[PDB]
Structure 1
């Protein structure tokens, strides 16, 4: 099969012809129909995963096949696989744990001490076939097709968990920074579909602000025009928001929006963008605010988002299909910020 792999750090990804794995035990072999590409892949091609080294820190034995956003048809199964048949359309949770550690025993597999992340330190979906270590990490698609589901295994589960960490309910108000972007609109849809909270979205361009409203935001704010903090104080009547979800934060967002927090407000940070949180401790203690990290998600999170998307209660991202061979080009577009919607490869 064809495979686009990270052969040498720095250089561009290399197309190779390698053997097709034979699944044993609980393993499943998927014929890839959709392989999502996100900004994470820019870092990956560099050797890092958010200021790390898939090589030094995550023990990768180059080359590895990228592609952590996976959907496709079951091609073959090991003899321990139960509940799935050749031909089933499935999406795959790539954030897998080994089972024995603390995080795996308490149901936080994605935080496993020895992660098995498909597309990051295990061969991924940038190929005609990919091996799924255990069939339990799959979800049968009935409403969505591969292209629509694949991005959900990453952006879907990520914003789903962030909304959860926002501890929302009908009595609260949520601020989504960058609400007009791909991640942002996903967050808005998920918040509206599951919390009942009042949703405020803020973005910089007009199209974005428009998109956030379409996604279901109760209030939208163009930071280019009005003062975000002033508008939030107006809308919340000076209380502030009970939660902020800052998707792919920056030095900017982190220096601004924490000021919008209401007492007991939670500032949920997502993404690996290199920035530092500077903040006056006494402020944190007086207001009982909280800064909380969030990355990808667990089996429960995956189950939840897939259930929402298959229910139609949440809508597929704007995607742009491309060829397996255009992998580098797709990553370049993200590295240059010229990417249309979510780019998905079709082997």
Structure 2
């Protein structure tokens, strides 16, 4: 079968012809119908996930097939698979754990000490077929097709968990930084569908500010034309927001938005490539604010985003379909910031 893989850090991804794996036990072989491509793949091409080296830190022995945003049809099942049949269309949760470590035992499998992350340190969906280590990491698709579901396994689950980490309720206000981008509009949609909180979206280009409003933001701010902090203080009557979801954590956002927090406010950091946070510790104590990290999501987060999406309560991302052979090009587009919409490869 065809597979686009990282063969050498410093070279582009390479198309190889390799054998189709045979699933055993609880494994499932999926015939890929959609392989999402996101900014994380710009770094995977460089052999990094966050600051982590996939070879040195995650134990990867190259080559590895990329593609952590997976949906497709069941091709074959191992003899211990229960509850699924050949032909079923499913989305896959790639953030898998092994079961024995502390994090797995308490239900936070994505923080597993020996992770099994498909498309990151295990072979992924940039191929005609892909092995899912255990059938429990799937979700049958009824309303969505593969292209609509694939991006949700990464962007959907990530923002779903970040909204949960924001600990919202109707008495509160949420600020989403970069609310008009793909990730930002997904966060706005989820917050509007699940919390009852007042949602403020901020961005810097007019199109983006409009997309945030289309996504459901109650208030939107164009940081290029208005002082964001002053607008936030006006909207919240000087209280500040009870949570910020910062999808960037750049020198730029970290130097402004933490100032928008209300007492006990939660600053949820979702970016994997940003700056250092510099903040006066005594002010964190006096205001009881919290700086909290959020990474992808666990099985419960996966079930939640899939259930929302399958019920039509949040809408799929804007996508552009491409061929498996254009994988390098898709990643190039993200590097050069020329990508419009979420790119999805169709093998």
Provide, for residues 301-335 of structure 1, a one-character-per-residue CA deviation record: whole Å limited to 9, x for no partner. 00000000000000000000000000000000001
Are 2:213 and 2:219, in contact at CA under 8 Å, matched by a contact in 1? yes
User: 2:186 touches 2:317 (CA, 8 Å); kept in 1?
Assistant: yes
TM-score (normalizing by structure 1): 1.00
Measure, in 1, the Cα distance between the counterparts of 2:305 and 2:159.
Answer: 9
- Take 1:275 and 1:60, find their aligned partners in 2: how far apart are those partners? 27
Alpha-carbon offset, residue 10 of structure 1: 1.2
SS at match of 1:238: coil
Q: How far did 1:48 drift?
A: 1.0
Q: Which moved more, 1:94-103 or 1:246-255?
A: 246-255
After TM superposition, give the deviation of residue 22 of structure 1 in Å: 0.2
Structure 2 CA distance for aligned equivalents of residues 137 and 217 of structure 1 = 32
**For 2:332 and 2:278, how far apart are their aligned partners in 1?**
32
CA distance in 2, matches of 1:88, 1:309: 18
Task: Report the 3-state secondary structure (helix = DSSP H, G, I; strand = E; otherwise coil) of the residue aligned with 1:3.
Answer: strand
Deviation at 1:51, TM superposition (A): 1.1
- 1:8-60 deviation digits (Å, cap 9, x = unpaired): 01100000000000000000000000000000000000011111110000000
Q: SS in structure 1 opposite 2:45?
A: helix
What is the CA-CA distance between 1:249 and the residue it aligns to? Answer: 2.4
Secondary structure at the counterpart of residue 274 of structure 1: coil
**For residues 169-199 of structure 1, what are the alpha-carbon distances to aligned partners after superposition, in whole Å with 9 as ceiling and x for unaligned?**
0000000000000000000000000000000
**Counterpart in the other structure of 2:160:** 160
Q: Which runs of 4+ in 1 moved over 2 A?
A: none
Residue 193 of structure 1 aligns to a residue whose secondary structure is helix
Question: What is the 5 A alignment of 1:247-326?
Answer: 247-326=247-326
**Aligned equivalents of 2:96, 2:47: Cα separation in 1:** 20
Count of residues paired in the alignment: 347
Q: Provide the secondary structure at the position in 2 that maps to 1:130.
A: strand
Q: Could you give the per-residue CA deviations for residues 117-155 of structure 1, whole angstroms, max 9, x where no partner exists?
A: 000000000000000000000000000000000000000
Using the TM superposition, give the Cα deviation of residue 248 of structure 1 relative to its aligned residue in structure 2, in angstroms. 2.4
1:233-285 CA-to-partner distances (Å, cap 9, x unmatched) read 00000000000000122110011000000000000000211310000111100
Aligned mates of 1:274, 1:307 — CA distance in 2: 31
Q: Distance in 2 between matches of 1:342 and 1:258?
A: 29
After TM superposition, list the pairs within 5 Å mapping 1:1-347 onto structure 2: 1-347=1-347
TM-score by length of 2: 1.00
Distance 2:64 2:273 in 1: 23
Secondary structure class of the residue paired with 2:256:
helix
- Counterpart CA distance in 2 for 1:260 and 1:321 is 39
Name the SS of the counterpart of 2:291 in structure 1: strand
SS at match of 2:273: coil
Instruction: Tell me how far apart the structure 1 counterparts of residues 181 and 75 of structure 2 sit (CA, whole Å).
Output: 35
Shift of 1:211: 0.4
Distance in 1, Cα, partners of 2:17 & 2:170 = 54
Q: In structure 2, how many angstroms separate the alpha carbons of the residues matched to 1:80 and 1:10?
A: 40
Secondary structure of 2:255's counterpart equals helix
Q: Write the distance in 1 (CA, Å) between the matches of 2:42 and 2:222.
A: 28
- Cα deviation per residue 1:65-84 (whole Å; 9 max; x = unaligned)? 00000000000000000000
Shift of 1:166: 0.1
Inter-partner Cα distance in structure 2 for 1:70 and 1:44: 16
CA contact (8 A) 2:248 2:274 kept: no
Gaps of 5+ in 2: none
